Amino acid sequence: MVDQNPEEYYLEGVLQYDAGNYTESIDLFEKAIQLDPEESKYWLMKGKALYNLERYEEAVDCYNYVINVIEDEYNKDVWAAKADALRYIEGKEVEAEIAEARAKLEHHHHHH
């Protein structure tokens, strides 16, 4: 499993849920990364925070970062997150559509 130093810091996951201060979680999040940057799953959370914070532009910076620094350009969850960001951006609307389709590309057939 993943065990270095930001294991206990996970306490954040609780703050946001319980403590309605997405902003506060930043303090803890910043520390987690400060310990050692290499966990993408941690960056994905940041995007949702920035996006929800009405920071569509800033949130995008995180999505591109995860794809820039790390060639992990495949994370379905990451692509989906970006779509939500575009779904509320001042500019082209065709972009949000491409994202939704790109993320929902996996589609599904016969659930049973």
Summarize the structure.
This protein is mostly helical and 112 residues long. It has six helices and no strands.
Tags for this model:
monomer; 112 residues; mainly alpha; Serine Threonine Protein Phosphatase 5, Tetratricopeptide repeat; 60% helix; globular
How would you characterize the overall build of this protein?
The protein has 112 residues and is mostly helical. It has one domain: Tetratricopeptide repeat domain (Serine Threonine Protein Phosphatase 5, Tetratricopeptide repeat), CATH 1.25.40.10. Helix content is 60%, strand content 0%. It has six helices and no strands. The longest helix is centred in the first third of the chain and has 14 residues. The protein is globular. The relative contact order is 0.10. It is classed as structural genomics, unknown function. The entry lists the keywords Tetratricopeptide repeat, structural genomics, unknown function, PSI-2, Protein Structure Initiative, Northeast Structural Genomics Consortium, nesg. It forms a monomeric assembly.
CATH class label: Mainly Alpha
Number of DSSP strand runs: 0
The ordered H/E elements are: HHHHHH
At the third CATH level, what is the topology name?
Serine Threonine Protein Phosphatase 5, Tetratricopeptide repeat
- Outline: globular
**Oligomeric organization of the protein chains:** monomer
Q: What is the total domain count?
A: 1
Going by CATH, the homologous superfamily would be Tetratricopeptide repeat domain
Determine the strand fraction and express it as a percent band. Answer: under 5%
End-to-end Cα distance, whole Å, is: 32 Å
Q: Return the CATH architecture.
A: Alpha Horseshoe
Secondary-structure class: mainly alpha
- Rg over CA atoms, rounded to whole Å, is 15 Å
Number of helices: 6
Report the sheet with the most strands, covering strand number, pairing sense and barrel closure. none
TPR repeats: 6-39, 40-73
Protein name: TPR repeat
Organism: Methanococcus maripaludis (strain DSM 14266 / JCM 13030 / NBRC 101832 / S2 / LL)
Keywords: Repeat, TPR repeat
